Amino acid sequence: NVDNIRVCKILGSGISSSSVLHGMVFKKETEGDVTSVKDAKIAVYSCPF
Amino acid sequence: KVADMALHYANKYNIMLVRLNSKWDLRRLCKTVGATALPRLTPPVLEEMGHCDSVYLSEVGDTQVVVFKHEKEDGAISTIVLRGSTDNLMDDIERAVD
Amino acid sequence: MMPTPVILLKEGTDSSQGIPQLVSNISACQVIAEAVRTTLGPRGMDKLIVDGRGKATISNDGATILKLLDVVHPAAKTLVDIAKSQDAEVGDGTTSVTLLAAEFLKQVKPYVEEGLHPQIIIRAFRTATQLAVNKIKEIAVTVKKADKVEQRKLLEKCAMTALSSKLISQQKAFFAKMVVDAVMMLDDLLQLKMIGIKKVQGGALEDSQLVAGVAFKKTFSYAGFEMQPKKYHNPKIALLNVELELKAEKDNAEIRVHTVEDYQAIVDAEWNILYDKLEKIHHSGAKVVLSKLPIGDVATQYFADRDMFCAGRVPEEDLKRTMMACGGSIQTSVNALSADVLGRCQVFEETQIGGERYNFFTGCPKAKTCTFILRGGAEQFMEETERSLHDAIMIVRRAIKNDSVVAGGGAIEMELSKYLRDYSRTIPGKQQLLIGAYAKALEIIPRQLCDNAGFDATNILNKLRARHAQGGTWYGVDINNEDIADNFEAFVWEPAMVRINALTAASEAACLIVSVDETIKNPRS
Amino acid sequence: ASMGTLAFDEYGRPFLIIKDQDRKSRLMGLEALKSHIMAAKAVANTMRTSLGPNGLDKMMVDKDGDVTVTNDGATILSMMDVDHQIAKLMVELSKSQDDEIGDGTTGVVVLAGALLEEAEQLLDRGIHPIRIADGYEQAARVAIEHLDKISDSVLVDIKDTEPLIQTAKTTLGSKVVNSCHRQMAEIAVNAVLTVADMERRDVDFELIKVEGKVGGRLEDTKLIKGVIVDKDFSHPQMPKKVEDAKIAILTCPFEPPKPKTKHKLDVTSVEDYKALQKYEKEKFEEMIQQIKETGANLAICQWGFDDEANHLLLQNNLPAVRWVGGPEIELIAIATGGRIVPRFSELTAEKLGFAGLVQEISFGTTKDKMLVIEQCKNSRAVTIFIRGGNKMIIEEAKRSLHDALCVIRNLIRDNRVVYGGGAAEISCALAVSQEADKCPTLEQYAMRAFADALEVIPMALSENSGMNPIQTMTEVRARQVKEMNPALGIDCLHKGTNDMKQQHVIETLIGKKQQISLATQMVRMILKIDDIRKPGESEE
Ligand SMILES: Nc1ncnc2c1ncn2[C@@H]1O[C@H](COP(=O)(O)OP(=O)(O)O)[C@@H](O)[C@H]1O
Ligand SMILES: Nc1ncnc2c1ncn2[C@@H]1O[C@H](COP(=O)(O)OP(=O)(O)O)[C@@H](O)[C@H]1O
Ligand SMILES: [Mg+2]
Ligand SMILES: [Mg+2]
């Protein structure tokens, strides 16, 4: 599937510094206070919280 | 959206909140994590619960990003982080990647 | 040009191709560069730009000046883009990137004019840039002692060097000490939003202060506010996201009663709801109450009667900073106001600051934030002060990430130019000319420094070249002494990544501009 | 000398760099510095005539034709309709001096103009503007240190207010209210001292109410240790004067209660109607009885009330005032010592404020009434009531009294003073000149220019008073050098002596320091700007 490859464009460090991440990157922030999880257990809801 | 009471109670129980605007991103995240997009606020069963090696907030350049990182060399969806000194240059590199 | 009955593209489409359009692009890049030339170095000047609305802006910052210019030339916008990129990634050197890119283009302009294939120029630029970046990484001075005093001195020197080009350069030592102290209190991410910057008009620059805590302006006090005490010696702070007002329970709530007793009961129930919230807050033991949401006059008078302090409509960023400084939690509900979710600071006080009232939270021992209070005689004075402090803060953050420094004042550019010339002397000769042009273009920085300072640039450049070839790595322009000096012992220090990113971005922009052979403009819609 | 450059390419193809570049304009190099210096000199020369006791006023007219006559430099520059950016910088400088100190807004503009005037010839002699700015900065440092050295401390205690009276008098000397000079000075001192936290803390200005009504005489301006209110008694037949009034401050309208939530009371039978009417009548009677039970004599409300409550208040010998503004409610509660009560159910005797006399005041053949609440026990709020022959002198008196209050506040913050009349500038210039004799040659020119620019204040004072500027300033400087007396200034009022310590001309030290600092910083900014890019489109 071609759409399974996502491209994130973050400006500044020259194209030689690009890398490949096994996952996804979203250009946004967390709503709450917790900002890092090491054993994530994501629960996804399509409805408003 | 995220309600204020819900956010406060999530902060009380040490739960990370991420709000995805586009349903396409929600579907892609569900694919790359292994979770099912529930339609209500019911607790998720063990099958519908998604898993990932690390979720964290980080800053690249001057933009804050949320990263869903897998340690394994596998996954339904993989992403390429393109850097560069110009928007047009990154767009051209994206065309080459395509 | 025979007029075809049906033309190919839309009428009014403009196309320019070949050597002339590339030469025009180089000239446009030169025009963009010369608009920021004089703002380089300790003798640099400021630019004033007035927009259509008549609101002027004054800045020494290259990225700000370029953004305020309404650049429409497609090739010239690349310089603005790389200036923005350098500002984003590093935060300092937004003038050096543009000067270097335009100098590269100017140096290779004669070769372009005589039909040289641009791919050769692009390859030569990439080779030279790779070599220069490797040289910067190799010769950058790093101290592997992990000494706190040494690290603090390194950060202070880097901040001073970053600041010694702005209108706050006279108090650069004072401001650099303040910036280093501010940055070192951030925990692990060094988020900019955790460093508040408040601009209060009136007062000297030396009146600027850094508070080890949080401070913000008084926010529309209601009646009965002046009856509250304005100083506490060990307050407990109740950070809240709650509207303490008499209002409808919900926007869609409707009350239906058919008895006057029920009418009175409903009125008393609304009053009892408000008083229950207020009583829970009061019995929490807190003395200072801050809310992200409005606090009504009834609640203000209630807190005044209890010798408490209240403040509503506090901005969200200020509340987050207060959280980080005091160590509580923003509560949307008051049903569980346990002692752990309550902030704590040694001294809270409301004071007069130059014609305005501010709330001061000081004495926070576990503080992870700070607030800058900048004093100045005009709005643009404080704005330029804020921009300069932002440059210093970014430099200090990057230096915290990695402590590798190279002497400034044109020393690093001179050394790189010497290295690149020595390399280019040992290659066939088609690439030799272009790499030599790159090395010559690297000399723009000390030349522009000398030009801005008013020296004779040629003699200083000759002395610098002789010193570098004879031996000596960190010899650069000495502005005060009209001469050259060892800029490493003069503590003209900048992080290596500043020059690394500058060279990388300038090379990428020059290659992108050179690679273009035709420009086509469609008619506007 | 505009629109940057114009090339249209060597090959003749179009060369468009900046949007609308053909209509924009720019100024580069020393020409920009000269234009900025010219604009600043024009502004400062306009302003310098309003400096000192003999300074003259400027009659300012706004868009709508309203006219204000004033001597305040900050007000003059705020109402001025300028377009030059450097003029706007001068306006911002004056406003900054007003905000931080409150006095000296005219001095900073003149000092900055003089500094830029000297920098003009320094630039023409071939000196980098940054060198001039650095020399100015170090000269200002020397001058501030000298000012700290030659300062004097004064007592800021209540028992002996004479130094405070003299300082306020010196502040008010240049204003039109000097016809009531000592009276205004004394009322300003008393107002500041009344509302002030003792331990050198701030003086909160919203505790000072400045109110002005036309008519009467300027000498009739008085200090009220209470509150003046634009309202009056609600019912025309309640007494106009209450003695030893026990105030009852309320924020609940004297109306039947109404829930905030959307509510509907259903009437389903005649019994429901009778019960509703009885409820209304009993609610009115109950609220009046609750007010009366505390023993109150006067009732102050914020949201007004209706006819039944008004007549019940009149019938029960309870004069009342309605629709009082929130700030006035707060001031009344603070002064009288009472507490603001949100509803009648919480009204108790301990929450009643006390006022010695509450009176309604007439103003001649005008039908307007205003309420006086004075003779409080320990009033922590004060009010200044200004009268005059027209609204222009009333506004000028308002701003002059504001200047006096600001000066006394600054004295509270720091009690060190220096003697004005140009003495401080002369001493600072002498110190700067002495230091320049030891400096290396290149910065010597900048320091000497700074000293000459400092010397402009005595020149302006002497010119405004009709004396010869150069001769008078030179004689005073020679006298200051020959005998060590930094208190010798320009005898503006021709009292026959040059010793300002004897003449009681007193200025706050922090005011002078702020003047010098702000002037130096703005001059540094203006010197540092070398490029202007105006749109130049001249739209409508
Ligand atoms: N004290 C100094 N002596 C010599 N050169 C300096 C000094 N301080 C800064 N510079 C040089 O001035 C150049 C420009 O710095 P600055 O104008 O502050 O930011 P930018 O790089 O964005 O123009 C830097 O390359 C630095 O090497
Ligand atoms: N009685 C006086 N004799 C001599 N000089 C005076 C006297 N009163 C005021 N001055 C001087 O006049 C100058 C102008 O004061 P004023 O116009 O009131 O405010 P500003 O400082 O804003 O101009 C002051 O610097 C002061 O030194
Ligand atoms: Mg810099
Ligand atoms: Mg004055």
Side-chain angles (χ1 to χ4, degrees), chain A residues 29-49:
Chain A
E29 296 177 354
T30 74
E31 309 285 321
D33 281 340
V34 186
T35 52
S36 174
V37 188
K38 299 293 115 178
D39 217 359
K41 294 277 204 68
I42 302 107
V44 185
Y45 300 96
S46 70
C47 56
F49 200 58

Side-chain angles (χ1 to χ4, degrees), chain C residues 39-42 92-96 161-162 164-165 408-409 449 477 492 494 499:
Chain C
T39 74
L40 189 85
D92 182 30
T94 70
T95 315
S96 297
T161 300
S164 88
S165 178
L449 285 174
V477 184
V492 192
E494 43 194 3
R499 270 316 171 264

